[PDB]
Amino acid sequence: ADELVFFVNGKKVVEKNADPETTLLAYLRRKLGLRGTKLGCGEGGCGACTVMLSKYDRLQDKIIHFSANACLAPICTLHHVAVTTVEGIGSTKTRLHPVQERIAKSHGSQCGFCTPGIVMSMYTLLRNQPEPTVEEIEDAFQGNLCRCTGYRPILQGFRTFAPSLFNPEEFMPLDPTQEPIFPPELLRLKDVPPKQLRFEGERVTWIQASTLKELLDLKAQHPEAKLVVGNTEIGIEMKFKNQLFPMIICPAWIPELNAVEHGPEGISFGAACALSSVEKTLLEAVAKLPTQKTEVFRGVLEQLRWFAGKQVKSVASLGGNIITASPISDLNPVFMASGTKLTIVSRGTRRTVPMDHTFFPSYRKTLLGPEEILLSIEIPYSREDEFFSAFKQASRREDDIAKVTCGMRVLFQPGSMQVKELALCYGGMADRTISALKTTQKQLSKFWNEKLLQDVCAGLAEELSLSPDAPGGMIEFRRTLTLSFFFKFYLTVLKKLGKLDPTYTSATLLFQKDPPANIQLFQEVPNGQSKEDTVGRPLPHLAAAMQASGEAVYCDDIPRYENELFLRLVTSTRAHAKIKSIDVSEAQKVPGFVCFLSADDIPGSNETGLFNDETVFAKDTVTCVGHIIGAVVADTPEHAERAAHVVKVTYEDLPAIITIEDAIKNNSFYGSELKIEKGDLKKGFSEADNVVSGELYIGGQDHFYLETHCTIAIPKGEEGEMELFVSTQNAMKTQSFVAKMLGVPVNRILVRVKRMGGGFGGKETRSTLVSVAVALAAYKTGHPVRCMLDRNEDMLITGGRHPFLARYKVGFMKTGTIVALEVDHYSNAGNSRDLSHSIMERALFHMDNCYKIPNIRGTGRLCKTNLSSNTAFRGFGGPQALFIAENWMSEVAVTCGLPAEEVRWKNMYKEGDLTHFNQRLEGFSVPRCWDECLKSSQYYARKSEVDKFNKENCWKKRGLCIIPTKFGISFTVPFLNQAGALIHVYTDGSVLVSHGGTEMGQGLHTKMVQVASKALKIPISKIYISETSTNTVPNSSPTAASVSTDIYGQAVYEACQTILKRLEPFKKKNPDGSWEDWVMAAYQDRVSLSTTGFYRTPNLGYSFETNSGNAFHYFTYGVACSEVEIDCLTGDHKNLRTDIVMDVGSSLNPAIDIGQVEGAFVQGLGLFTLEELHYSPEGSLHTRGPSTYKIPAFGSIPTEFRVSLLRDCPNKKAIYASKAVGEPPLFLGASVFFAIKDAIRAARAQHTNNNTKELFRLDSPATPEKIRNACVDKFTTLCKPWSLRV
Amino acid sequence: EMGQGLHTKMVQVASKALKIPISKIYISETSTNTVPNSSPTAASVSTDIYGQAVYEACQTILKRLEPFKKKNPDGSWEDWVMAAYQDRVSLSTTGFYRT
Amino acid sequence: HFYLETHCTIAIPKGEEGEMELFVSTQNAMKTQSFVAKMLGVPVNRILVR
Amino acid sequence: CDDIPRYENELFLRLVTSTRAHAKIKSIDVSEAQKVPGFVCFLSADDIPG
Ligand SMILES: Cc1cc2nc3c(=O)[nH]c(=O)nc-3n(C[C@H](O)[C@H](O)[C@H](O)COP(=O)(O)OP(=O)(O)OC[C@H]3O[C@@H](n4cnc5c(N)ncnc54)[C@H](O)[C@@H]3O)c2cc1C
Ligand SMILES: Nc1nc2c(c(=O)[nH]1)N[C@H]1C(S)=C(S)[C@@H](COP(=O)(O)O)O[C@H]1N2
Ligand SMILES: O=C(O)c1ccccc1O
Ligand code: MOS
Ligand code: MOS
Ligand code: FES
Ligand code: FES
Ligand SMILES: [Ca+2]
């Protein structure tokens, strides 16, 4: 093998034994020790692994810079390429780069795991355009996801490159002259002609071909050899589909495969040209050539706008997309509809054919022979009388897989409306790209008119049929899209042939962004407050700079010991079955295999889980797909994964219960019914003028913390001692569960948590699934062992939010006043209890939202099913119950024919009222939040503008909704409301604070340092918090229920008071001395400078049996108004504007609190409108990665996004008058859901029927499928019994 | 610990003070983030001074557990400890001594 | 002295805020901590000696 | 201490000490040291940050 030579951050790397299977991400992290680049998914959709690549382009005679996903970039494609990672642009140890400084100071980093990738996407943009436009800045992040921030701060801080939370005037200006130079050595090497290279790995041989002749000789000798250019398809096939291609040929260096030629018929691109290059060339052509010649080009560009992100488009080749031949390719339908010419060659042969329906004969195949390669593609200029359109509709606009995608072309006889040629090609409607030939052939010679529209729609409905078992489901929606896209094409062509009814015009408009507008309002601190007292000030997260530089250490970033091994979980592939046998004979053959662990290897107990109803490793039976059966330990992660894949388990299926309906039918529940009942329901229903009954469903949610679960376990070899580094919110339970499994006392186990790259409740208990397995491996082998879950394992195994089904009945007066309410809740709990009971209790505690209901009955049942156990997720049952409440409230308004805001206001609690669980509402600020939100959002004025828009538009509608929320603060299990701290003041006066809480991005340590600095009256610079550990603060409650600031704040405060009391005698003797003087005097006088602090929330204890006692210490409140615009023909929608007013008492840190409000709101927006998990009828999760599970993207947030923290609202019940903010704002994301529902009502009034009191059901999430299907019209109708009783 | 058996003696002291077997007590290591500003282990006084500091920390634990012992006199150390935890009483304390 | 185990130290730099964790054969973790902090020019609270 | 496993990237230090009871250090030449396989660096007073 030849040496692979490339550069990383300006340093030369010579790899003498490059393995073709090694990705750049693995190489950076495991060989170069550069851990700033992260693994977030391994499938190209999160951007956490983003790096910049720079090379000398021989064809352009210039150095080019572009971004790429290190998780998919083979190092074997990087010969003579210069890589720049986050570490290469700046650091806190030298100096931060402006991109790093701004994202940190703008509050654009919370947990920090996505920060390096976003920093690199932004950095790459600036290296290409030092003064980008706002649009270029937003587009730079099509391929980057953040789960914490809600995106607003990242964009607002970066907008600077185009009281207040940050000051742009302080920012260091960008100076391009100070950027690292391209490696001089690489610039010299450019003067040496390319030579063919060969790399040999453990399983694969890679040939880098330098010339076209070499490529053709290689393909003639090895027809099976797999070509790889960008690796964005092959990398997925290798990693996720268990494919192994022993020989790969990379033809990327070949001039002919990279040539661009402008011919008389069109523009030709070599097959290796990156999509970003195609995009640039076509944009240039569209700007220079007449509109009539660029119809096809604009179609290609419209698809490229929504094709992955910058990282993928910069490496993905044209040839790769065409030859991969995926049924959902967004480009093949366009190339097929336009008859794009393909030049195909093999040694000694060359032919050119226009792409047509025959080019794709069957699933993933094309008409190329085994020895042939695609050389170039010529995209045609459009002719006179020829028009083209391309459309794509997915689950999320940005970086998503098409549900239906198409290319449509029509050629008319000269100057007429008479069809000469017509081509309608679709992706997503079959196992290959297809053309609706039967349908289009019938229109040849017909004229473009209403009858043609009807005939084509009827034809498409018949020809593009979908059987009920079609892969991907969404049968009705997909068929509706095929007709809807044709309708858009039809109207667009009429416009181009030309007037369209003005109310129809917007149906022809391509998606357009409106400029962003963001405002944050909060309260300034008192005039006389000391500059060193930072409580109330917008201090950035203390680790934000290190997060932006890639220096912040997350679990897997901790270096491995030389003898450290890797663990891979072996999980069930059946929902419910007996395990008959396990065969490890094949796994034992994989190189580096160490051992297979199972239940029999456990030295202590195999009984685990919060309620002791789970196994550590399955014994005799598996009860869900993903149920952990055992684990393989090996010398490398790849070897452990390969060995685990071949462990063969033989099963015998048992009857399974998957759904809530299955559980109810089978009486499959955990425990008995939970219930809260107040008043007289029968009397209430008798009094009611109206009564509405219904059923509602809300789907689950995957946490999608950017850092998945991970544990490192270090066995000491003495007395059973073990030290573990874990990404968990619950070190205490990690510690006791590990000790229980090992059969040793809890005092032998040390758990340390530095920080988590997100938790969101998902790491409150389920992190032990991994911790305990890794601990067993360390115990059995005597070696350190680690495991970080891949995203697909994480989504499958670890549980998520509980789906809820509700059956309700509400009685109300004609005025809208509620007089009775019954709601029966059912949650899908999965295969163990875990936190399901407490979650249902919190759901019952919030079924009132902010409304007084005199007679009310709510019940709850936990469904026991053969699915992974669901758990805590930000909101913990509250969002589900609050959603159900707002759904019936929205129906009361509709039924009464009254404005929704009036009906909500008149039902709202008042100061001093009692809730349905009889707790008094003291300091009830919803009314102020409501009136202020109505005013600042200009709700009334906009309501009329929305109505006007709906009158003027037939196929687009707007919706507006304002909703309130209240969230009870405290753990509903009394004993968890306790908190400890430990503080030491060293002899130099520096202070080390330790407390029971953990940092997961919410800024808890930052707030505790702010609190300690105010209490001690010393600068925050003298205080430090390093980590959370069980040997500093024991028996800690999980960092949850949004109360960490409240309780650890008090514990830290109390520890500081003790320190002050001890120092007082020294301060009195030397009043003019310094803190350092007093500390040293205390030390010399032998006064201890170490103390604990503790806090117990008072007066808590509610009983469901007596419906009495305080469930919560106080409530956090807020109101949100959101406006949306839906596309009635596709299901897509824009979040136009959202205004939030939140009561967080006297904020300890308005930057962090506004960040929590925005982040929580966006996660709620995701829950209610974008995020959906799909499972087979047998209980197997289909959606296991960002490609199929769509969380909010940069482009998903409200365009105008305003957040205000309520002024003059101190909360006497918590530290420094503040209020909990973690979870309360999430439900406000439902304001988007109800604005969408309002818009759908307008669309139904327009095309469905005139029943203005109709109550149509809309379950959550309101995805494009649900939105489109609810917009009933002539198209949904197109996509019988012998007798009917009269 | 440098071989002189200081941790052994401290476990013996803590066991006598708490009136529980030494098997329930453990000392893993010495660290600056658990006990700060320590004098060097020297002058032959470690047993004397850390013995007192350990003794005092044990007294504080006993005082916190006393209400639970009085409520359930026939219970076990484990019962009292869990009752204290469930009642949100801290089971962590410092101890200190000055000759 | 002829202690059978001679002097020994392992120093682990964390890469964050000057933090360092040291495993040391010493009777004086306090002075080890402050002397390391003094040489590095960082506050004593950044140094952990075990 | 030395029984604690080494990290995969853990390096080793060897002190360079005076061979004279009392003298001026005129110069230090590490050119031969730099040739030893595995050499990473020579550290001296000017490398101290604090
Ligand atoms: C996060 C993500 C998002 C994506 N988004 C989209 C999307 O929105 N729409 C869409 O359609 N696709 C999408 N893709 C798919 C993928 O990026 C494209 O199919 C890409 O264009 C393939 O190019 P490549 O160079 O990376 O292919 P590779 O993976 O390198 O090769 C792909 C296949 O093409 C063959 N091949 C390559 N070049 C030639 C040639 N010259 N002659 C003959 N055979 C050849 C290879 O042998 C292999 O079978 C996405 C992928 C990821 C990872
Ligand atoms: N950035 C970030 N913010 C977050 C989370 C997170 O994992 N990352 N977890 C949320 C959840 S589920 C909770 S309960 C609270 C917990 O922290 P707190 O009690 O300090 O507010 O933070 C919320 N905000
Ligand atoms: O929110 C709660 O009420 C709660 C109760 C018990 C455990 C975890 C929790 O979040
Ligand atoms: O209470 Mo959060 O960890 S769901
Ligand atoms: O006092 Mo002993 O350490 S000489
Ligand atoms: S880890 Fe590479 S895109 Fe997510
Ligand atoms: S700050 Fe972006 S994922 Fe946490
Ligand atoms: Ca559960």
UniProtKB/Swiss-Prot annotation, chain B:
It comes from the Eukaryota. Mo-molybdopterin binds at A43. Subject to partial proteolysis; this alters the enzyme from the dehydrogenase form (D) to the oxidase form (O). This is Xanthine dehydrogenase/oxidase. Homodimer. Interacts with BTN1A1. Belongs to the xanthine dehydrogenase family. The chain holds residues 1037 to 1135 of 1332 of the full protein. Key enzyme in purine degradation. Catalyzes the oxidation of hypoxanthine to xanthine. Catalyzes the oxidation of xanthine to uric acid. Contributes to the generation of reactive oxygen species. It is found in: Cytoplasm; Peroxisome; Secreted. Detected in milk (at protein level).
